[PDB]
């Protein structure tokens, strides 16, 4: 009744064989698993049901077995097209479950880029507006995986920021990260030192870019 | 014979 | 699968989406209602009968749901009630095949829960500097920060500056707002030589600004 999936993401160059994996708690009755795909910006388009039936307008690439527990969707050579997120889901008929996996993201594998970091102190105009926001910007990096962590005076800030990744560019093959500390008018001014500490696997120590005042 | 559409029609026969 | 347009609900409130289809293709058939949390997974909601409301509702959702069919316009209604900070996702509609996975799915519909004042945008400079510039590239950008609802469209010297840009997706705050970060790496050469310009237009409180990003 509750599905998990490995990997997280899977970097693989186009032309590979891939192969997802959906391990469940329980059994799934009369094999009742499906496989999903679902690219940016668009909804989930079914691929495989029933573990290993196909479905109308799937390629012969995409192979799906599994039973109980252990399910499996491999890619025989993958192409431009295959590169998305999917999602295994667990379907029942007494009662009506229907539940989903957490989601495995398939990329297009590249050189590990470091993400280059940029720290923009927030402009008189908003601190003459009462508001008081920083940014850090992470530029063209690959894997995707990036802390981003923001320390306001050696003080770790948890809550105060928002981030938003960018889907892999179609040219580059790369990520890009833009993460908001806003903070009011006045909590501002209190403090000094405000850095953006990066950890990355371009990196090879952890990079901090910071601003006084 | 039965698929998952006629068991699911069960569901709401019995309740 | 046509479904309805985005909503903007208040916390608290209820939101009615509905889903109109084709006869063919849904009164022979069974319906599911999910949804996708910004950045998340997909959560299967209920299932709405061949004809009437032999409906199967969701343990999270239950008792805060109501799926409802209407033969004569051929359409599926999901209402959620007590609306929640994590009820903000896009919601679709989703017919299930004769073996139980959906094959045909819907366009989908974004149920953002906030203030809903309708405020416009606010865009702020991003200028550049050392701290942002390193090897001959320079970072500079725009901050288009409090604005409801969405979207915003943002634009770099008029169309003339397209390599480089990137317009991050914008992300809700407390405030029941949105914010977006427009940013483009430029040479440095030519930082104080050239005008970078971001246009930023907000068709549903009908405001266009354009700000000149000039380095520190």
Redesign the interface.
């Given at each position: 009744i509750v599905l998990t999936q490995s990997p997280g993401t899977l970097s693989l160059s186009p032309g590979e064989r891939a192969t997802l994996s959906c391990r469940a708690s329980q059994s799934v009755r009369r094999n009742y698993l499906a496989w999903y795909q679902q690219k940016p910006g668009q909804a989930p388009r079914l691929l495989i049901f029933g573990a290993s039936s196909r479905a109308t307008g799937i390629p012969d690439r995409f192979s799906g077995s599994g039973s109980g527990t252990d399910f499996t969707l491999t890619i025989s050579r993958l192409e431009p097209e295959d590169f998305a997120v999917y999602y295994c889901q667990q379907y029942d008929s007494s009662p009506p479950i229907f539940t989903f996996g957490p989601g495995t993201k398939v990329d297009i594998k590249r050189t590990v880029a470091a993400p280059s970091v940029f720290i923009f102190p927030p402009s008189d105009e908003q601190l003459k507006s009462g508001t008081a926001s920083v940014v850090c910007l992470l530029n063209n990096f690959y894997p995707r995986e990036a802390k981003v962590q923001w320390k306001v005076d050696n003080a770790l800030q948890s809550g105060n920021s928002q981030e938003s990744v960018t889907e892999q560019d179609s040219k580059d093959s790369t990520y890009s990260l833009s993460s908001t500390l806003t903070l009011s008018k006045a909590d501002y001014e209190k403090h000094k030192v405000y850095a953006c500490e990066v950890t990355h696997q371009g990196l090879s120590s952890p990079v901090t870019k910071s601003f006084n005042r | 014979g039965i698929d998952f559409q006629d068991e699911l029609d069960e569901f709401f026969k019995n309740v | 699968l046509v479904q309805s347009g985005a909503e903007v609900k208040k916390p608290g409130a209820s939101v009615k989406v509905s889903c109109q289809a084709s006869g063919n293709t849904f009164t022979n058939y069974?319906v599911?209602w999910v949804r996708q949390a910004p950045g998340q997974?997909?959560?299967?909601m209920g299932?709405i009968?061949?004809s009437?409301d032999?409906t199967?509702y969701a343990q999270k959702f239950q008792g805060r749901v109501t799926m409802t069919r209407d033969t004569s316009t051929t359409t599926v209604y999901m209402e959620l009630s007590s609306l929640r900070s994590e009820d903000t996702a896009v919601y679709?509609c989703?017919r299930?095949?004769?073996?139980?996975?959906?094959?045909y799915?819907?366009?989908?519909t974004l149920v953002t829960v906030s203030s809903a004042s309708t405020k416009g945008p606010?865009v702020?400079?991003?200028?550049p500097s050392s701290?942002?510039?390193?090897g001959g590239?320079a970072?500079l950008?725009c901050?288009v920060?409090?604005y409801f609802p969405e979207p915003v469209t943002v634009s770099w010297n008029s169309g003339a500056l397209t390599s480089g840009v990137?317009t991050?997706?914008?992300?809700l705050?407390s405030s029941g707002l949105y914010?977006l970060?427009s940013?483009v790496?430029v040479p440095s050469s030519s930082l104080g030589t050239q005008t970078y310009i971001c246009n930023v237009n907000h068709k549903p409180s009908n405001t266009k600004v354009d700000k000149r990003v000039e380095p520190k």
């Open positions: - | - | 069974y599911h997974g997909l959560e299967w299932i009968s061949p009437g032999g199967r679709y989703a299930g095949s004769n073996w139980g996975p959906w094959d799915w819907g366009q989908g606010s702020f400079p991003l200028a701290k942002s510039t390193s590239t970072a950008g901050l920060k409090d990137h991050f997706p914008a992300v705050q914010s970060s940013v790496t």
